[PDB]
């Protein structure tokens, strides 16, 4: 249809809260989505979400966003951040600026996770603050679009 913000979630994040809950909390992707949908609605901003484990699905969704009139994308590419040049060219290709978000501190883990094909082109980046990182990106986008 049309939606001012677009939240994207990369591969594996559908698994939030589905293992032994005693391992990574009880907070699910749908919990996160509800929260972002509420927040956006309280500001009278249209918002839309997408998640997939398939890179070209995400790439298609980004192309579709250009036609739907999206102004900002909030993206947690999960593992795609270290590997996907197509993802970066898609974002650049459509010239929709974006904020990169990670639930975990990516700098605290393996060394290959320090490198990102997206960070240098983001407005900015939030890693390690869990769910609230998405909320903060939204907070920031709402202030850029409708002061």
85 binds a copy of itself (CB under 8 A): yes
90 binds a copy of itself (CB under 8 A): yes
Catalytic: 107?
Answer: no
C-alpha closest to that of 76 among 25, 138, 19: 138
Catalytic: 102?
Answer: yes
Residues whose CB is less than 8 angstroms from the CB of residue 129 and which lie 6 or more positions away in sequence, other chains included: 103, 136
C-alpha closest to that of 51 among 23, 67, 75, 81: 75
Q: Which of 56, 69, 145, 146 binds a copy of itself (CB under 8 A)?
A: 56
60 binds a copy of itself (CB under 8 A): yes
CA 45 to chain centre: 17
Tell me the C-alpha to C-alpha distance, in Å, between residue 47 and each of 1, 21, 86, 109, 116: 11, 28, 24, 32, 26
Element (H, E) at 100: strand 98-102
3 binds a copy of itself (CB under 8 A): no
108 binds a copy of itself (CB under 8 A): yes
138 binds a copy of itself (CB under 8 A): no
Q: Which of 21, 25, 69, 124 binds a copy of itself (CB under 8 A)?
A: 124
12 binds a copy of itself (CB under 8 A): yes
CB 95 within 8 A of CB 75: no
- Among candidate residues 9, 102, 117, 134, the one labeled active-site is 102
**Residues that bind a copy of itself in the complex, under the rule CB under 8 A:** 10-12, 14-15, 18-20, 52-57, 59-60, 63, 66, 78-80, 82-90, 93-95, 99, 105, 107-108, 112-114, 116-117, 119-130, 132-133, 136-137, 139-140, 143
Catalytic residues: 24, 102
């Amino acid at each position: 249809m049309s939606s001012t913000i677009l939240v994207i979630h990369g591969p594996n994040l559908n698994l939030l809260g589905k293992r032994e809950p005693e391992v990574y909390g009880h907070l699910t992707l749908d919990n996160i989505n509800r929260q972002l949908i509420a927040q956006a609605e309280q500001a009278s901003i249209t918002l839309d979400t997408f998640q997939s484990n398939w890179e070209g699905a995400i790439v298609d969704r980004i192309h579709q966003a250009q036609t739907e009139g999206v102004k900002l994308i909030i993206i947690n590419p999960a593992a795609l951040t270290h590997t996907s040049v197509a993802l970066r060219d898609a974002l650049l290709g459509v010239a929709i600026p974006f904020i990169e978000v990670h639930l975990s501190n990516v700098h605290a883990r393996e060394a290959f996770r320090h490198h990102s094909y997206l960070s240098d082109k983001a407005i900015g980046v939030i890693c390690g603050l869990g769910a609230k990182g998405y909320s903060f990106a939204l907070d920031y986008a709402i202030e850029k679009i409708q002061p």
